[PDB]
Amino acid sequence: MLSFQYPDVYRDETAIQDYHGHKVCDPYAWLEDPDSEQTKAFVEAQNKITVPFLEQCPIRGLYKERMTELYDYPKYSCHFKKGKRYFYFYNTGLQNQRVLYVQDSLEGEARVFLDPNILSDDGTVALRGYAFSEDGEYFAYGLSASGSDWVTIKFMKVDGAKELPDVLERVKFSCMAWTHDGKGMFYNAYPQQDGKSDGTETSTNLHQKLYYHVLGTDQSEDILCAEFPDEPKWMGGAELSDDGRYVLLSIREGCDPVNRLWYCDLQQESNGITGILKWVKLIDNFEGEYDYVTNEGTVFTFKTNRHSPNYRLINIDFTDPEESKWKVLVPEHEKDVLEWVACVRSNFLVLCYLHDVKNTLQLHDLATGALLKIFPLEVGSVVGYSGQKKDTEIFYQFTSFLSPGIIYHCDLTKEELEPRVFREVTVKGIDASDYQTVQIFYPSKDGTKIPMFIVHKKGIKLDGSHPAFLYGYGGFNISITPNYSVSRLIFVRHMGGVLAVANIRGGGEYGETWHKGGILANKQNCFDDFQCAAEYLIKEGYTSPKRLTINGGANGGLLVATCANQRPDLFGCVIAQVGVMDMLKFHKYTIGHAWTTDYGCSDSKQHFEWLIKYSPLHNVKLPEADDIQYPSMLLLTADHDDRVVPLHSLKFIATLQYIVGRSRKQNNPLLIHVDTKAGHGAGKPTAKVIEEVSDMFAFIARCLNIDWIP
């Protein structure tokens, strides 16, 4: 029979709530309290059955060993210049956290500048955001403990890497920007709250404020520069214009790519920064995004999606601000998304486009917007870039499914520009030439063509005999572009698998129209798109239902969990990482209120009607057909995940085990693993990353009985 027994989990049958006339029972609502002895006992009981299941078969050890070996390669970030020095991140291979290095010259010897590894035994203290003073002589950096979004900002004098006394607490979702006079720095902080603020609490985050910290003073002396007491969800991030004249405030409410844009000419302040600034409300609504690129006097260049879903560049003159007067510097492309733009060497613009989910990099003239040079790239993604207005060179990093990456360098003072390979590392053991990456477009239920990348060993027969790993996200205007993953390549090489990534709606692959096609009333399009990706892989012979594994994280966790409820017959295995499972209550915790722009909010009758149909927690149901059971499922979360509070996964697994786990026909396991000293994922130490992928693939291996291929 089964190899283990599911834990006893109390059902509060009195937990009933009325949603617009619809009665909803939430028997596991008590799991919403992370501090109770009841919840702690539940987590321990679940981990007690999951760990032995994952470690029983020797395949986990074989995988972990191969991952440790293959992932052990030098990892560099591209160089960036600040003041008179160069900086770059580098991990010898298996250090828990990458280290920040500094060199006084491009050819000079480098030395350790900031090593987060020495801040904890297990590498659970990580760098989260940083900002150098304009002259590059001072450095502010954020540290997060145990994977929490909470940040503590510390300071250092660059020359001699001297630690300073300045410490800023209660920082979260904060920008960091120094005024060019070198006096201090703008940052965001939240008011004091009852209970903990370490990542284990579920408390909603409201009333974020903008402060200014004068270097050499106590945080209690900080100046409040902006606040929105009547709009608790507004978040204002500050940045200084390239010439240091203006503070630009980008105010956001929710997750859509839109923002208010206010500015303050610092020279117009009566006596420096002493209180709420004299904000000029240039764009005082949430109808479009205005991303600062650079300015020349009062003429500001912004990347925008205002009446341009694929994005474009516009110049707004603060002295003649009306929309009818704006100049369109670089018009919107009919299909290619303008992902980001930077200004370098005074009058050059670096534009990065996404063409059929692949990146292109171009250099344009700032005055006219004319194309000047195309920087050639293979099929993949640009994941790093450096080069600000005063710089005379650029560095950019390229990655793809089969290559770790290449860091390029280009001296922009040269007449005939030509980038050169600055750094390149290959992984011995993974001969990229034994594999191939293809891109196909499959029709979804409504006929819309969806892109999908498929990576596999060359020459395989499309006889449906291969295990497959299909990944998706689908939301928040996030484009899922090619990236290097040793863990996935081990699945291909050592488990004979096929990798697939479906660029479903909700994402940003085809601009804001793509995004809107997967949100609110149309969120079901994401699930349909993904299910259709699975059907394609099956019909085309890459895999079969019992050999197919789907995976996603956060909004992607919601994706795969919903797909399991809707089409349990289509998948053999489902791994949902830190997923949003309770779609009726997500807005109640931490930063969840910001996601209503993609999902809607249950308080609304209309939204509730969309949400109730797909919410994973509210759609667990035994398959009607006797020959159909739920696929094997593994939920992965961590106790400091304050982005997507773990109660989502706790309640979902309790429900899966009770409604489906108790059925005689259910033989596939439904498990959860809650990690400690970890959170949503950012900053997770290498050691934990390796344990995680080892758990994932051991689960797939055991559930589908896959033999290891040495």
Partner: peptide, 7 residues
């Protein structure tokens, strides 16, 4: 500072 359920 990316406050979405990104993963």
């Amino acid at each position: 500072x990316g406050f979405g359920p990104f993963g």
